[PDB]
Design a protein around this ligand. Structure first.
Ligand SMILES: Nc1ncnc2c1ncn2[C@@H]1O[C@H](COP(=O)(O)OP(=O)(O)OP(=O)(O)O)[C@@H](O)[C@H]1O
Ligand SMILES: Nc1ncnc2c1ncn2[C@@H]1O[C@H](COP(=O)(O)OP(=O)(O)OP(=O)(O)O)[C@@H](O)[C@H]1O
Ligand SMILES: [Mg+2]
Ligand SMILES: [Mg+2]
Lengths: 574, 616
């Protein structure tokens, strides 16, 4: 629970004065609640014993004032507690999001796009719940216990030994129960985590599960996880079921000892009768508050693990930032250098790109050809500066991508990745990610360029046709054409087609390429493709094998001098 | 919109089934509550005995109670005699500590019995709560496995995930956190009311005035707070949706310069959800102080009136002490219910969402017949299908596939090839017509066996978080190590696995890992081929795989492709060449079909498609 304290200390400091106001108001309210029985004892002693009804009425008015103070201070504490809890939760969420948005591809891949979502909302909620339950109930038990001890000492110090001995017994019993419960609760949380991951995997790959008839194995796995979770929860509940009886028993035994010892003191003229009522109410308030506070302690292990996850997210430091003072060329539209680039993924034993050196002149088309796992997508990601070169330099427009701020470099680059993603909403909304200010006319022009205008015009809603979460309401080629249209609507200086024509038929692929050549004539294009038929039109073709460039030149020189490209052409020949 | 009362009563019915264990739970709770409520009367009797002895000790022993009363009347202020009138002392006796000890021993025994009964009832409640939760989780998982694909395609993954896991966990927390409190409160209120009615009707009426007023205040607060709760839930859902869409497509958002817009939208949603949560939480927490205030007003009235009666002599002091204890033990359950109202409402909302998911329409009545392919011949007969009915995607389609024939499907980008092979796997219900494999309608056989008989390479590759060996063995986990190694070698997964320093043990994920798109497709191919399917479907199975590796893979799988009726979908004509039958479909209808030689001889769409390679 080291990370819990750090997170609370960091993100509750702006609300520390509201917390102090909550604390003082709760103290006042609990003091009023424990002082009402003192006024009852005063009625019993200075009233019916003396025979003064006027004193009884006066003390009733005093009790009315005490109750008014109690309700006012309770409402005032609830309001500020809610304020502080919601503020802490909102600030923690806004900090986690702001940290995650600075992550790189590798940093985000460390946790995943779903773990970050579950840590941004449900991990902050489980700590704001602790905040609220501490400013509402967990603070009541110490306040009520110490205040009741003081009030019992005030009423009659002779019988304060009871109230000072009974409370430690309850404290030790509840401490034993907590010490035997907390490991079980940690196990229950760590085991419900697994049954949640199982259900997430079952829903993310439902089509693959159905296609392979993996329903019975999924059922068996879920049944085993459910049974183990139920065993852990039953073991926790067996201990948790002792909390209320072991507190009520202490209250009742304390009350019986009260009636005995107070009676013994009363026979000696050392105690008034109303003190018995006062002490009885003190017991049934002090110990009931402790019981209520302790019964709720299902949060601390859960909050501890949630805070551990949040702190591990917030401790991750990015590796690709604007260096100190980025160079800002006007309208970057130049060439790509790639001089002796050497890249090795973090945690990898061997580099994936070795001694890569090829230049792409501005306004030309360069096709990257290689085997599976050769490093074409890695090179494309290097151009986008999603990853930083371990050695060498890239030199886009004659200047390193490292010293260029990555907002203008990305504004000058229109990238359609191999693993594309279409956001849920409308086709117009998805295309707006390219421009965000595009009119309907240029949106339709971008759709027409990417051959995506027909299947959007077909829908009765036109540009407002719905899009599923991952575009699963479209075909794969339709998703690729939508991504191409999104890249086109940007009108970027550099196009990076990372296998953007894999799911397009020959006719549609040729039409899209012709429209692009008509539109992107003045723009640099780097296209990663498998078909040789699409690479003759490229001015320069680069072949990479094992991660290193094995051939540079046009189609004819590569077919004549590079054995790998000759093998590719021979394999694809009809 | 959303019915919370019905979901609450359904959840209560699930929690407390027919009288097998819930009857014992209720009986134990009632017995313990009655035994523990009896005790304060005993304590009041002991206090009455102490006061009687103390008062009577001071009075002279030569006079009885009536003489003492008349002597006090002869004395001043009059009220002492009224106090003694209802006291029933024996003057000059003192306190009898033996009777006090007996009374307190009886109280201690009753309190011990009540504590034991409460413990047993709590254990039984825990057992039944866990049983109910197990049943709920099993039902949720079965419903997940029975839902149609349109249900998942029409919603975000995060929303369904939260409705499936987070809502169930919230329900579990709420029940195991509040069921015992609810039962104890509902029994204790009535037991205390009965014993207060036994003590004195006036003071118990004064105490019971609170319940109407407390209910009115609670109703007002709930009326003011329910819109806040629904707004908070809506706002949390919107925030979670925005977070999921930003995180899943982080590369696209970051690259296309939309990070600032996403940050601004998140800030707006965060502020709005903060406001909604603050309002809901404040109005939900306001219940307990109000109930405590009304209970304290009743306590003040009861104390004052009881003191007035005790001074007059109509009620003994021990009875009034018992009644004060009863007032406190009556006000406490209402305060506890008011305090836990927030958790109760959260659990009710979660149960509402879970029941909404569980009441969704399922696919269809699955046939119990086990699919059994004998030869492998596939036939389509006027198959018509359409997602979102009103726009056909496949209409008037008919095709025949010989048992050893390799059928290749080529066509435009939105023809319907994936829809066709999904209809073959019974992913979606065929609108009109039927599909027959070896003369039996696929709709008349179980989906499980039919989909197990066919090994399909999905167009969108998917891998679950685990080792590469686990992902390959996902097709058939019972296969031994040698079979998985052979499947990986045939698909040339082993070629790049040997390169990695943790071969077959490196952990890969759908969104990343130590893998590439081509290698991910290779692992999917190995997973498909491991299951030794009797029917082969390959939907753009090598779209991201180079042709040099494709040649080796084709040679390696030629043993399987000989006698398994492969369905090959590809936009590369080289892969689909030399297929026994080639289907060209344009807009969900097969415009032309035949082998390569006939297709070239008759010209048509295929000839134009293959002349693009030669240029024009
Ligand atoms: N939920 C859905 N899933 C898939 N297709 C859908 C869905 N709803 C509607 N459709 C429509 O179904 C049509 C049939 O396309 P299909 O999914 O069969 O792709 P395809 O012909 O295999 O394409 P490609 O060759 O690019 O893979 C598409 O035009 C698409 O708009
Ligand atoms: N985190 C990682 N992400 C991607 N590749 C990684 C990673 N770690 C290691 N690699 C290695 O990087 C190599 C090259 O991957 P990359 O995706 O760049 O290849 P590629 O030739 O572009 O792929 P494909 O032809 O399938 O599109 C792979 O062989 C893989 O083992
Ligand atoms: Mg790639
Ligand atoms: Mg498809």
């Amino acid at each position: 629970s080291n990370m819990l304290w750090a997170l609370l200390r960091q993100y509750v400091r702006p609300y520390r004065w509201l917390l102090a106001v909550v604390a003082v108001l709760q103290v006042i309210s609990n003091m009023a609640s424990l002082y009402l029985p003192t006024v009852n004892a005063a009625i019993i002693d200075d009233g019916v014993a003396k025979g003064d009804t006027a004193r009884i009425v006066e003390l009733g008015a005093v009790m009315l004032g005490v109750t008014a103070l109690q309700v006012v201070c309770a409402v005032g504490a609830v309001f500020f507690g809610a304020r502080a809890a919601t503020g802490f939760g909102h600030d923690l969420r806004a900090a986690v999001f702001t940290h995650v948005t600075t992550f790189s591809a590798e940093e985000a891949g460390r946790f995943g796009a779903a773990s970050l979502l579950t840590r941004t909302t449900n991990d902050v909620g489980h700590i704001q719940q602790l905040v609220q339950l501490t400013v509402t109930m967990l603070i009541t038990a110490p306040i009520m216990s110490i205040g009741g001890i003081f009030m019992a000492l005030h009423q009659d110090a002779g019988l304060s030994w009871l109230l000072l001995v009974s409370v430690p017994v309850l404290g030790l019993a509840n401490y034993w129960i907590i010490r035997h419960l907390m490991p079980v609760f940690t196990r229950m949380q760590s085991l419900i985590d697994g049954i949640n991951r199982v259900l997430r995997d079952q829903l993310s790959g439902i089509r693959v599960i159905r296609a392979f008839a993996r329903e019975p194995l999924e059922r068996v796995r879920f049944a085993e996880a459910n049974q183990t979770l139920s065993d852990s929860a039953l073991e926790a509940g067996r201990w948790q079921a002792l909390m209320l009886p072991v507190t009520t028993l202490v209250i009742n035994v304390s009350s019986v000892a009260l009636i005995w010892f107070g009676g013994l003191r009363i026979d000696a003229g050392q105690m008034q009768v109303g003190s018995l009522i006062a002490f009885l109410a003190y017991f049934m308030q002090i110990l009931m508050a402790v019981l209520m506070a302790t019964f709720m302690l299902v949060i601390f292990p859960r909050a501890a693990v949630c805070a551990d996850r949040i702190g591990e997210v917030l401790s991750t430091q990015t590796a690709i930032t604007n260096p100190a003072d980025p160079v800002r060329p006007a309208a970057i539209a130049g060439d790509i250098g790639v001089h002796d680039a050497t890249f090795c993924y973090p945690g990898a034993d061997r580099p994936v790109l070795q001694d890569v050196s090829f230049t792409v002149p501005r306004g030309t088309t360069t096709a990257v050809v290689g085997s599976t796992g050769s490093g074409k997508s890695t090179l494309i990601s290097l151009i986008c500066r999603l990853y930083d070169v371990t050695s060498g330099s890239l030199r886009i427009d004659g200047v390193d991508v490292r010293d260029l701020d990555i907002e203008q470099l990305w504004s000058a680059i229109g990238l359609v990745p191999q693993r594309g993603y279409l956001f849920s909403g409308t086709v117009a909304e998805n295309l707006r990610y390219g421009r965000a200010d595009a009119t309907d006319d240029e949106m339709w022009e971008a759709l027409r360029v990417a051959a995506a205008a027909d299947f959007v015009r077909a829908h009765p809603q036109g540009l407002d046709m719905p899009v599923a979460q991952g575009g699963i309401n479209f075909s794969g080629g339709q998703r690729q054409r939508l991504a191409i249209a999104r890249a086109v609507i940007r009108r970027p200086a550099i196009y990076l087609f990372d296998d953007a024509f894999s799911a397009l038929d020959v006719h549609t692929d040729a039409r899209v390429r012709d429209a692009l050549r008509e539109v992107a004539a003045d723009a640099t294009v780097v296209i990663v493709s498998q078909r040789i038929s699409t690479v003759i039109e490229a001015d320069q073709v680069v072949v990479i094998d094992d991660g290193r460039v094995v051939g540079i030149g046009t189609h004819d020189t590569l077919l004549a001098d590079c054995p790998i490209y000759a093998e590719f052409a021979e394999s694809q020949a009809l | 919109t959303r019915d919370f009362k019905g979901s609450a009563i359904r959840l209560a019915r699930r929690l407390l089934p027919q009288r097998a264990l819930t009857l014992a739970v209720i009986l134990l709770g009632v017995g313990g509550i009655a035994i523990g409520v009896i005790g304060p009367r005993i304590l009041g009797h002991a206090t009455d005995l102490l006061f009687n002895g103390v008062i009577g000790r001071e009075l002279p022993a030569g006079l009885t109670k009536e003489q003492a009363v008349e002597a006090a009347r002869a004395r001043g202020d009059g009220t002492f005699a009224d106090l003694l009138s209802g006291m029933d002392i024996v003057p000059g006796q003192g306190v009898d500590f033996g009777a006090v000890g007996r009374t307190l021993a009886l109280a201690l025994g009753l309190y011990l019995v009540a504590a034991l009964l409460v413990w047993v009832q709590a254990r039984l409640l825990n057992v039944t709560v866990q049983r109910t939760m197990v049943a709920l989780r099993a039902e949720v998982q079965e419903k997940i496995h029975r839902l149609p694909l349109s249900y998942f395609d029409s919603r975000q993954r995060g929303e369904v995930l939260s409705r499936v896991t987070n809502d169930v966990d919230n329900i579990q927390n709420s029940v195991s956190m509040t069921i015992s409190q609810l039962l104890t409160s509902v029994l204790t209120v009535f037991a205390v009311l009965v014993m207060m009615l036994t003590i004195s009707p006036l003071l118990t009426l004064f105490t019971v005035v609170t319940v109407p007023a407390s209910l009115w205040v609670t109703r007002w607060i709930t009326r003011r707070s329910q819109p806040l709760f629904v707004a908070q839930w809506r706002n949390t859902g919107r925030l979670a949706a925005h977070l999921e869409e930003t995180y899943s497509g982080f590369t696209i958002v970051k690259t296309f310069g939309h990070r600032e817009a996403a940050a601004g939208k998140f800030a707006e949603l965060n502020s709005e959800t903060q406001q909604s949560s603050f309002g809901a939480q404040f109005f939900s927490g306001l219940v307990s102080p109000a109930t405590m205030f009304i209970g304290n007003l009743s306590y003040v009235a009861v104390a004052v009136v009881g003191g007035l009666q005790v001074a007059t002599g109509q009620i003994t002091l021990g009875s009034i002490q018992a009644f004060i204890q009863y007032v406190r033990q009556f006000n406490q359950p209402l305060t506890q219910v008011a305090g836990m109202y927030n958790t109760l409402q959260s659990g009710i909302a979660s149960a509402e969402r879970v029941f909404d998911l569980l009441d969704t329409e399922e696919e269809s009545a699955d046939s119990p017949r086990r699919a059994d392919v004998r030869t492998g011949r596939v036939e389509f007969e006027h198959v018509s299908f359409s997602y979102v009915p009103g726009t056909p995607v496949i209409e008037d389609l008919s095709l025949v596939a010989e048992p050893g024939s390799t059928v290749a499907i080529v066509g435009p980008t939105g023809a319907g090839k994936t829809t066709l092979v999904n209809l073959l796997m019974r992913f979606y219900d065929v609108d009109s017509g039927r599909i027959t494999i070896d003369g039996v309608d696929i709709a008349s056989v179980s989906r499980e066996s039919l989909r197990a008989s066919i090994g399909m390479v999905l167009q969108d590759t998917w891998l679950f978080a685990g080792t590469i060996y686990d992902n390959i063995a996902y097709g058939r986990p019972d296969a031994d190590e040698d079979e998985v190694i052979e499947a990986a070698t045939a698909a040339y997964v082993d070629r790049f696995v040997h390169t990695l320093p943790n071969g077959y043990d490196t952990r890969v994920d759908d969104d990343g890992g130590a893998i590439s798109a081509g290698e991910k497709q290779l692992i999917t191919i190995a997973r498909a081929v491991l299951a030794r399917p009797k029917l082969l479907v390959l939907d753009q199975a090598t779209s991201s795989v180079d042709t040099r590796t494709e040649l080796l893979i084709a040679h390696a799988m030629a043993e399987l492709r000989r006698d398994r009726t492969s369905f090959i979908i590809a936009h590369r004509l080289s892969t689909i060449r030399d297929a026994d039958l080639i289907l060209v479909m344009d807009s969900g209808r097969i415009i032309e079909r035949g082998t390569h030689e006939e297709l070239l001889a008759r010209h048509g769409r295929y000839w134009e498609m293959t002349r693009v390679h030669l240029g024009g």
